[PDB]
Design a binder for these strands. Structure first.
Lengths: 98, 67, 318, 223, 143, 141
RNA sequence: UAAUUGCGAUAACGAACGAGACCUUAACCUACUAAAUAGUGGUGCUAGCAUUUGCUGGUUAUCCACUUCUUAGAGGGACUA
C-alpha cells in the first residue's frame, strides 16, 4: 500500500507572472482534477527592490513568491513535480507545516 | 490640451463613412461598439477614437461636416 | 379629443446615472425598483406626493458597471438586475442582499425577465446570446442565432395558463425578433422587417402580440399568438423601451425625444409626453430610455436621460 | 542551498550572464545565437541555439563533451548536473545575431563593404522580415574613423515597439587597421510575431461592413 | 461605568502615578539618581532631582499596559531622543540601558511588571490592578 | 452578530479601519474614546461629522476604529474619513437610502474629506536634486 | 498644440521616422481569487476596572466564519465625457 497523507507545501517563485502563474494554476487544476486539497495560491508580496547606478541612473526588481499547499499523497506529488517542467520557475517541495 | 492627430480624426471619419448608424453620440455605447468593430490596440486609444466619434457623430446630428 | 390622458404627477431624484430600467410590482403598488447607469439600483417606496412621488429606500451597491435591466417579480420581493459588468443579481428589494449571482454572459447583460410564474429568469446580452436561468444560478439555456446583439428578451405572459410553451421573445440588432420556444430550446418564430435595428420589444399582457422597434422607430406589431405579422406603428425617433399597459392597449414608446403613448385598439396616438425642458436644446432633449405602465397601467413610470424618473397618472377629462 | 531568494535570483542571473558571454566568445564561428538554461530533475540543460551545431556535437562524442567538461570543472558541476544540448536555429536571415556575425566574418573575409552588406540585407528581406539594418563603423585606411548603414524594409525607433519587434546586435570585428562595431537591427515581421502583438500599437482596422439587407417587409417565417 | 488606563489620557495619569509611587516608597532608585543622564540622547541631568524615576516608572508601566511587551532596548529606543551633533544635524540614539532596565526591575519588584515570555515585559495582574485603580483615581480627581 | 458595516479611511499614509457595529454608543480610538486623541487642537476636527447630522446617531451604532501609520494629522483625517464612510454605509445598508442622502446632504454641504478619496500623495524625488521639482544648487561655475 | 500635434486654407496623391501610439508608475475597486508568510470580528480560556449588560487586555492555533481595510493578479475605469 502507498499514497499516505504527507502534507506537501509547494513554494512557487519566479520573476515572470506568466510562467509562474501558469505553473501555479497548473498545480492548482492538476491537483483539483483528481480532487486534492489545496491552500489555493497565497500570494506573498512581490520584491520591491531598487538599484541606484551611475548623470545618475536607477533600476529595480520582480520576486514573485507564492505558496500552494497540497495536503496530498506522495504518488501524485511526485507526478506533479516531475511533470510541467519550465524555464525560469523555481519549485520548492517542502513537507508538513513544521 | 487634448488635441487629436490625423489618425484619430481619420478613423472616426471612416467610422462615419461606413457606420453612421451604430455609433451615435453616446460615448458609453461607442465604447462597446468600437470594441465590437475596430482592432484598436489599446483601451486608451480606443477611448480616444470613441470620444472623437462621440464628437463627430455629435456634430453630424446637427448638420454635415467637410469631407 | 379624449376622455383620459396622462398628466405629470411627480418626479423622483436619488439617481446619478441614466435610469436604464424601471420595474413595477403588483404585490405592493408603492414599489419602484430602478436600474440605473450609476452601477447601483435604487428601490423606492412610492408615497404618491405631487413633488416627491416616493422616497429612496435602498441603493443596491454591488454591480460593478452600468446596470441596464431590472425586472420585478410581480410580488416585488425579488430584484432581478442585469448590468454591464456581465452579471445578473437577485437582490432583495428592501434589504439589499444579492441572493444569487448569474455569471456566464460574455458581454453586457442588456435584458432580464422572469416568467409570470416568477420561476424562470431569461436574460439577453451584448454577446448576442440568450441565457435562461433558475433563481439559484443555473444557466440552463443558451439560445443562439442572432447575428448582432440580443437587445432585450421578455417572457411572454402566456395566454392559456402557460400552455406548455414558455415562450420568450428576443429583439436582436440583426433587425429580427426571434420568438423562442423553451420546450426544445429552439426557434419558434422569425419576425423580420426592421430598417434599423431593434432596441426593445414588448408583448401584449395576454401574450398574443409583439411591439418591437429600434432606431428607425418602426414598432412592428406582430400577432405572437399566431406567430405572424400584423402592422407597424411609426414613432419617427430612436425607440428605446416599449410596454403595453396591463389593462388596456396603450403602448408607451420611449423615443429619442420623449414618450409617445399610442392606443392600439382603437389605433391612435394618445399623448406625446415630452415634458417641457427649460435650458435643454433641440437634440439635447432628455428622453426616456425606460418606461413602464403600472400594475394597473394608471401611472407611467419613466427613466429619462437626465437621470430622472418621471411619473404620469392618467387623468380623466374634465 | 541556504541562499536568500534575492541572492538566489541575482546569482542565477550572474550564471546566465556567464553562459551568454562565454558561449558568445566560444561558438561564434558556429553562429552562436543564444543559450537557454532549463533545469529539470536530473538534468540542467544549456541549449545552444546556433546555426552550425554539427560543429558543436563533435566526432561521435567530442567538444560538446569538452564544453560540458569545461562548464563542469569551472562551476564545480557534477557530470550530469551540466547537460548542454545544441540546436540548429531556424531562419538565420531573420537573426540579427547571426547576420551580425556574418558581417564580422565577411569583413574578416576581406570581402566588400557595401555589396556584401546589402546582399545580407537583401537576404534578410528574402527571409520575410519587416525591416533590417546593418551598421559598420571603425577605421580602415583613414585615420578618421567612419560609418556606413545598410537598411531595407521598415523600422521603428522608439517605444515598447523597440522592445517588441527589433533585434539589435553590436559586434566588434577586429581588423588590422582598427576595430569595427557591427549593429544589425532587424525589424521582425509583426505578422510572424506569434508571442504577442501582431501589428503596431498604431494599428486600427475598420471593417468595411456589408452590402446590407434593407427593409424586407415583414416576411414572417414561423418555426 | 468601568475604567482602563487606555481609557485615561496618558500625561495626567503619569503625573498622578509618579506622585502615587512617590507615596508608595517602593522605589529602587539605585543610588546614582540625578548624577545620571537617564538617556544617552540628551545632555543635562533632569530638572526635579528628587524623582524623574517615578515619572519614568509611570511611563513604563502605562506603556506596558498598552502593549504586549517591550524590552530594555525597546525602552532605550523609546526614551532616547535626538541629541544635537553640533555642527551637523540630529540623529536618534538608544537611551541609557541601565536606567530603563532599573525601572523594569523596580516595577518587577513591586509587582507592577513581570518578565515576559517571547522576551520583554508584560503588565502584571497587580500591575493592571494598580494602574487601572489609580487611573480611576486620576479620572475621579478630575470628575 | 449585530447590524453592522466595516469601512476604512485613508490620508497620506495613515490608514484607519472602522467597525460600525450596533451597540450603546462607543467611539473608540485604539484604546480610548474619540475625545482623548491629542493633537488636542485637532480634537474639534475629530468632533466634526457627529456635529453635522445631529450628535446622537451612534446610540444605535458603536464605532471602533484602529489606526496604523502616518502622523497624527493624517491619523485624525483618516479616522474621521473612516467614521463618516461607515456612518453613511450603515445608514445605507440598514437604514434607508434617503437617510443616507440626508447624511450626504449634511456632510457634502460641509465636506472636509469625510467621504471622498483624495488623490494627492508624495510624488517621486529625482536625481540631480533633493525633491520632486527642485534641482541641485549651482554657481554657473 | 505638449508636438510639421493637428486644424485650416492649398500644383498633387498615397507613404516613412519622430511625436502620438506603446512601457511603467500615484490614484478607484465594499464586485472575482486566495491568504497561521496579511487583516477582520465572534468564540474558547482568562488579567484588570466597573458591574446591569460592558470597556480594555492577552492568545502565530482555542477554534469558527469573512477578504472591507493589507497583499497582488485579472481587467474595468477616463475619452478631457
Amino acid at each position: 500500500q502507498q499514497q499516505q497523507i504527507i502534507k506537501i507545501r509547494i513554494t512557487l517563485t519566479s520573476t515572470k507572472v506568466k510562467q509562474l502563474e501558469n505553473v501555479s494554476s497548473n498545480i492548482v487544476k492538476n491537483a483539483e482534477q483528481h480532487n486534492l486539497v489545496k491552500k489555493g495560491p497565497v500570494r506573498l508580496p512581490t520584491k520591491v527592490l531598487k538599484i541606484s547606478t551611475r548623470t545618475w541612473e536607477t533600476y529595480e526588481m520582480r520576486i514573485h513568491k507564492r505558496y500552494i499547499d497540497l495536503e496530498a499523497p506522495v504518488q501524485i506529488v511526485k507526478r506533479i513535480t516531475q511533470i510541467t517542467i519550465e524555464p525560469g520557475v523555481d519549485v520548492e517541495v517542502v513537507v508538513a507545516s513544521n | 490640451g487634448r488635441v487629436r492627430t490625423k489618425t484619430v480624426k481619420r478613423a472616426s471619419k471612416a467610422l462615419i463613412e461606413r457606420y453612421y448608424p451604430k455609433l451615435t453620440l453616446d460615448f458609453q455605447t461607442n465604447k462597446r461598439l468600437c470594441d465590437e468593430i475596430a482592432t484598436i490596440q489599446s483601451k486608451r486609444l480606443r477611448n480616444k477614437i470613441a470620444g472623437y466619434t462621440t464628437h463627430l457623430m455629435k456634430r453630424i446630428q446637427k448638420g454635415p461636416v467637410r469631407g | 379629443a379624449s376622455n383620459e390622458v396622462l398628466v405629470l404627477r411627480g418626479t423622483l431624484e436619488g439617481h446619478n446615472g441614466w435610469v436604464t430600467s424601471l420595474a413595477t410590482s403588483a404585490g405592493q403598488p408603492n414599489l419602484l425598483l430602478s436600474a440605473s447607469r450609476d452601477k447601483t439600483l435604487i428601490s423606492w417606496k412610492l408615497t404618491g406626493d405631487d413633488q416627491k412621488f416616493g422616497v429612496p429606500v435602498r441603493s443596491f451597491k454591488g454591480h460593478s458597471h452600468i446596470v441596464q435591466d431590472c425586472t420585478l417579480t410581480a410580488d416585488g420581493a425579488y430584484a432581478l438586475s442585469a448590468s454591464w459588468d456581465k452579471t445578473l443579481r437577485l437582490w432583495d428589494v428592501a434589504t439589499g442582499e444579492t441572493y444569487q449571482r448569474f455569471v456566464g454572459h460574455k458581454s453586457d447583460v442588456m435584458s432580464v425577465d422572469i416568467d409570470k410564474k416568477a420561476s424562470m429568469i431569461i436574460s439577453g446580452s451584448r454577446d448576442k446570446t440568450i441565457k435562461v436561468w433558475t433563481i439559484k444560478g443555473q444557466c440552463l439555456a443558451t439560445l443562439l442565432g442572432h447575428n448582432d446583439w440580443v437587445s432585450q428578451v421578455r417572457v411572454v405572459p402566456n395566454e392559456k395558463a402557460d400552455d406548455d410553451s414558455v415562450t420568450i421573445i428576443s429583439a436582436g440588432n440583426d433587425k429580427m425578433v426571434k420568438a423562442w420556444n423553451l420546450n426544445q430550446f429552439q426557434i419558434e418564430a422569425d419576425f423580420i422587417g426592421h430598417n434599423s435595428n431593434i432596441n426593445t420589444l414588448t408583448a401584449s399582457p395576454d401574450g398574443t402580440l409583439i411591439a418591437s422597434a429600434g432606431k428607425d422607430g418602426e414598432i412592428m406589431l406582430w400577432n405572437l399568438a399566431a406567430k405572424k405579422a400584423m402592422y407597424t406603428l411609426s414613432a419617427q425617433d430612436e425607440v428605446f423601451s416599449l410596454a403595453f399597459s396591463p389593462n388596456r392597449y396603450w403602448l408607451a414608446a420611449a423615443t429619442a425625444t420623449g414618450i409617445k403613448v399610442f392606443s392600439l385598439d382603437p389605433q391612435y396616438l394618445v399623448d406625446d409626453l415630452r415634458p417641457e425642458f427649460a435650458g435643454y436644446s433641440k437634440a439635447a432633449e432628455p428622453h426616456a430610455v425606460s418606461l413602464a405602465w403600472s400594475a394597473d397601467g394608471q401611472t407611467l413610470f419613466a427613466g429619462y436621460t437626465d437621470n430622472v424618473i418621471r411619473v404620469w397618472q392618467v387623468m380623466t377629462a374634465n | 542551498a541556504l541562499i536568500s531568494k534575492k541572492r538566489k535570483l541575482v546569482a542565477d542571473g550572474v550564471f546566465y550572464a556567464e553562459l551568454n558571454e562565454f558561449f558568445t566568445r566560444e561558438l561564434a564561428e558556429e553562429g552562436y545565437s543564444g543559450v537557454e538554461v532549463r533545469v529539470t530533475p536530473t538534468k540542467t540543460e544549456v541549449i545552444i541555439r546556433a546555426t552550425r551545431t554539427q560543429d558543436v556535437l563533435g566526432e561521435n562524442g567530442r567538444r560538446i563533451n569538452e564544453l560540458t567538461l569545461l562548464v563542469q570543472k569551472r562551476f564545480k558541476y557534477a557530470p550530469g548536473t551540466i547537460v548542454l544540448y545544441a540546436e540548429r536555429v531556424q531562419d538565420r536571415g531573420l537573426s540579427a545575431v547571426a547576420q551580425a556575425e556574418s558581417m564580422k566574418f565577411k569583413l574578416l573575409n576581406g570581402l566588400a563593404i557595401r555589396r556584401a552588406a546589402y546582399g545580407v540585407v537583401r537576404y534578410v528581406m528574402e527571409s520575410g522580415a519587416k525591416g533590417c539594418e546593418v551598421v559598420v563603423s571603425g577605421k580602415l585606411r583613414a585615420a578618421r574613423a567612419k560609418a556606413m548603414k545598410f537598411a531595407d524594409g521598415f523600422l521603428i525607433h522608439s517605444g515598447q515597439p523597440v522592445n517588441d519587434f527589433i533585434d539589435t546586435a553590436t559586434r566588434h570585428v577586429l581588423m588590422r587597421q582598427g576595430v569595427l562595431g557591427i549593429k544589425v537591427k532587424i525589424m521582425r515581421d509583426p505578422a510572424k510575431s506569434r508571442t504577442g502583438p501582431k501589428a503596431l500599437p498604431d494599428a486600427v482596422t475598420i471593417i468595411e461592413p456589408k452590402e446590407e439587407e434593407p427593409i424586407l417587409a415583414p416576411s414572417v417565417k414561423d418555426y | 461605568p468601568g475604567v482602563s488606563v487606555r481609557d485615561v489620557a496618558a500625561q495626567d495619569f503619569i503625573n498622578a502615578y509618579a506622585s502615587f509611587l512617590q507615596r508608595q516608597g517602593k522605589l529602587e532608585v539605585p543610588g546614582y539618581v540625578d548624577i545620571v543622564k537617564t538617556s544617552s540622547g540628551n545632555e543635562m541631568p533632569p530638572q526635579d532631582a528628587e524623582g524623574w524615576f517615578y515619572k519614568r516608572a509611570a511611563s513604563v508601566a502605562r506603556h506596558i499596559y498598552m502593549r504586549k511587551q517591550v524590552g530594555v532596548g525597546k525602552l532605550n529606543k523609546l526614551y532616547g531622543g535626538a541629541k544635537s551633533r553640533g555642527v551637523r544635524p540630529y540623529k536618534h540614539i538608544d537611551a541609557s540601558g541601565s536606567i530603563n532596565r532599573k525601572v523594569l526591575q523596580a516595577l518587577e519588584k513591586i509587582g507592577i511588571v513581570e518578565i515576559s515570555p517571547k522576551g520583554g515585559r508584560r503588565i502584571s495582574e497587580n500591575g493592571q490592578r494598580d494602574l487601572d485603580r489609580i487611573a480611576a483615581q486620576t479620572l475621579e480627581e478630575d470628575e | 452578530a449585530v447590524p453592522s458595516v466595516q469601512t476604512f479611511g485613508k490620508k497620506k499614509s495613515a490608514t484607519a479601519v472602522a467597525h460600525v457595529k450596533a451597540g450603546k454608543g462607543l467611539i473608540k480610538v485604539n484604546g480610548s474614546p474619540i475625545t482623548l486623541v491629542e493633537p488636542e487642537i485637532l480634537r474639534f476636527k475629530v468632533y466634526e461629522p457627529l456635529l453635522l447630522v445631529g450628535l446622537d446617531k451612534f446610540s444605535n451604532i458603536d464605532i471602533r476604529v484602529r489606526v496604523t501609520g502616518g502622523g497624527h494629522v493624517s491619523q485624525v483625517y483618516a479616522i474621521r474619513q473612516a467614521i463618516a464612510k461607515g456612518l453613511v454605509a450603515y445608514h445605507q445598508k440598514y437604514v434607508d437610502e434617503q437617510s443616507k442622502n440626508e447624511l450626504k446632504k449634511a456632510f457634502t454641504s460641509y465636506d472636509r474629506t469625510l467621504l471622498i478619496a483624495d488623490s494627492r500623495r508624495p510624488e517621486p524625488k529625482k536625481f540631480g536634486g533633493k525633491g520632486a521639482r527642485s534641482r541641485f544648487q549651482k554657481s554657473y561655475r
